[PDB]
């Protein structure tokens, strides 16, 4: 990510 508002958990990565 390069993005705040995301749609689709497939993209989310641990927070870290």
């Amino acid at each position, epitope marked *: 990510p390069g993005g705040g508002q*995301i749609v689709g958990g497939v993209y989310l990565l641990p927070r870290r």
Partner: antibody, heavy 118, light 114 residues
Framework: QIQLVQSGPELKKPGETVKISCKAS????????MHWVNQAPGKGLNWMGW????????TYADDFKGRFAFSLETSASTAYLQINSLKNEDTATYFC???????????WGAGTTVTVSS | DIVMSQSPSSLAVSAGEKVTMSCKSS????????????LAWYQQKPGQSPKVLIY???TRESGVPDRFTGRGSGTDFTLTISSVQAEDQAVYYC?????????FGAGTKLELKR
């Protein structure tokens, strides 16, 4: 408190255009993606797509690519949904919902129902 | 598109009983890195807009009674209501948000027997 206020019910003739608003309040409008969900009379929920509230970039589900358009007015913390070339089959109630990073809908508007008829 | 299948289509139970709802996806909601299933359950009563109950497949939304419990992982998920009351009469939907477009199940109508 956190709310999504939608415009009233609309009665449009086939082939016309309708534009409904979803005014957010109680939170910073530009921090959460605003999505739209429709429901035909007694038929269940269907995701139409969303509009990024900070970039203003809309994203449509295939089934709504064409006559449907998502827009904003950040200054007014309001989201819009416009349907052009209205079909009788567009009759339904449209909801706007706030989406979270945890991937679910936090708050919803009461929904706006639009009737296509002559 | 990820397909969500919900069943029964509807259920009727007596107050205080435990009811189990099923939802199965086309694919796997489970993100490898986050270790999350992006499956949520929503409750909708007549004329009202939906109201979320569960998100990551299990995590009860704040304000929702522990009576509701979401389980499952992968393609098999369930929603359970341990002590069913009249205020539970509604349609329940599961929604996947793993891979767009977000898709909903057909819903499961829950009524009471008396």
């Amino acid at each position: 408190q956190i709310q999504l206020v939608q415009s009233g019910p609309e009665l449009k003739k086939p082939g016309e255009t309708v534009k409904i608003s979803c005014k957010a309040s109680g939170y910073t409008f530009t921090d959460f993606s605003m999505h739209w969900v429709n429901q035909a009379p007694g038929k269940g929920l269907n995701w139409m797509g969303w509009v990024n509230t900070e970039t203003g970039e809309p994203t449509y589900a295939d089934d709504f690519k064409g006559r449907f358009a998502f827009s904003l007015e950040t200054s007014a913390s309001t989201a819009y949904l416009q349907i052009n070339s209205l079909k009788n089959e567009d009759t339904a109630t449209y909801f706007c919902a706030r989406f979270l990073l945890r991937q679910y809908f936090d708050v919803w508007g009461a929904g706006t129902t639009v009737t296509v008829s002559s | 598109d990820i397909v969500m299948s919900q069943s029964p289509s509807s259920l009727a139970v007596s107050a205080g009983e435990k009811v189990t709802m099923s939802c199965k996806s086309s694919q796997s909601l489970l993100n490898s890195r986050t270790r999350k299933n992006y499956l949520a359950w929503y409750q909708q009563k007549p004329g009202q807009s939906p109201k979320v109950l569960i998100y990551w497949a299990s995590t009860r939304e704040s304000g929702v009674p522990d009576r509701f419990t979401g389980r499952g992982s992968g393609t098999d998920f369930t929603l359970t209501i341990s002590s069913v009351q009249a205020e539970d009469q509604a349609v329940y939907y599961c929604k996947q948000a793993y891979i767009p477009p977000l898709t909903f199940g057909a819903g499961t109508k829950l009524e009471l027997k008396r």
